Amino acid sequence: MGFFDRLKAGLAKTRERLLKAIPWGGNLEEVLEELEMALLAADVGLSATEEILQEVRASGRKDLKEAVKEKLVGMLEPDERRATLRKLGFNPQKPKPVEPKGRVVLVVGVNGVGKTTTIAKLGRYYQNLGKKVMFCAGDTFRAAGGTQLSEWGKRLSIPVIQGPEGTDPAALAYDAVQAMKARGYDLLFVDTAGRLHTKHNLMEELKKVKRAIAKADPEEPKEVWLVLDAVTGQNGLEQAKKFHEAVGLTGVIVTKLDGTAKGGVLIPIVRTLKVPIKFVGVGEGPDDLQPFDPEAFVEALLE
Numbered sequence: 001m002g003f004f005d006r007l008k009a010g011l012a013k014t015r016e017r018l019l020k021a022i023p024w025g026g027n028l029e030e031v032l033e034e035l036e037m038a039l040l041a042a043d044v045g046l047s048a049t050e051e052i053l054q055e056v057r058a059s060g061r062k063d064l065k066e067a068v069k070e071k072l073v074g075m076l077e078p079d080e081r082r083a084t085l086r087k088l089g090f091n092p093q094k095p096k097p098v099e100p101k102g103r104v105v106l107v108v109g110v111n112g113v114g115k116t117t118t119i120a121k122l123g124r125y126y127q128n129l130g131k132k133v134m135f136c137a138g139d140t141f142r143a144a145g146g147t148q149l150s151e152w153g154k155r156l157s158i159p160v161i162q163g164p165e166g167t168d169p170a171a172l173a174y175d176a177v178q179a180m181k182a183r184g185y186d187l188l189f190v191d192t193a194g195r196l197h198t199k200h201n202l203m204e205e206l207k208k209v210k211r212a213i214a215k216a217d218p219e220e221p222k223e224v225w226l227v228l229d230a231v232t233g234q235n236g237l238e239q240a241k242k243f244h245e246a247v248g249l250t251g252v253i254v255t256k257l258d259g260t261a262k263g264g265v266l267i268p269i270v271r272t273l274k275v276p277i278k279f280v281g282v283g284e285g286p287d288d289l290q291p292f293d294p295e296a297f298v299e300a301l302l303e
């Protein structure tokens, strides 16, 4: 049964191309050559791959396989504090559940990455951790796979703040924070537009929605999570940069790991944006959106 199982399976396409075939017993030069190709071919990026090799050549004298494993895990953790408790030995089965710093999670990403679907899964997740959850449909448009955020709300018995198409989304977000406060909800997930080439500059609208939320609640939002589709790989991180510059990301959710051989992309993401990966999507099941665990992630990558 297990949980670690779904993760290993989600990384199957990624692992099976070259990683699992690396002969950790042959002489360095051969295992490193194979290593670098497998990293690059999995979208780790030349920058991180190069660093990995260097840290492994002249420093990685603990067991090549281990030196590698540990460097990769080190690269998946931005928060020194957590890497410390780890170096020490903290590592139970199920990782600590993700806790938002505040009550408002602003969700961003390009159209079609899966923000609506992810929000639905995050509602379920949090509702089982015993939290009052509310949704805000900030992308008030013809956006969805025929399933609006509104529908998912009814299904999960989560209230959805919504308005007619074209409604001012800042005003929508503002209302949602007020309704959250007034009715005492634990967490509000605010969804947003994702089209980069419409008549309203996207980054400006996101900045405007964040302003409105704080205006209604000064310290909010304490989380701004960007959703990225692993299938997009290489460029989904590029665009991610722009989002980071406009509204300050505190986190990233990567969906569809299972549909690409580019699952190594989690490395350049964390290194480039300097925020942690919060959840990873390993399938389309309700429990397929897992809380990220560097250690377990890397183990799955290499076994």
Ligand SMILES: Nc1nc2c(ncn2[C@@H]2O[C@H](COP(=O)(O)OP(=O)(O)NP(=O)(O)O)[C@@H](O)[C@H]2O)c(=O)[nH]1
Pocket: 109, 110, 111, 112, 113, 114, 115, 116, 117, 118, 139, 142, 143, 144, 145, 194, 254, 255, 256, 257, 280, 281, 282, 283, 284, 285
């Ligand atoms: N298997 C799987 N499918 C996913 C995952 N994340 C997103 N999807 C799918 O990708 C599609 C895009 O999701 P959606 O929530 O509609 O994206 P958006 O980013 O909100 N796009 P839109 O603006 O069209 O509403 C959905 O049909 C959803 O099933 C994941 O981790 N795993």
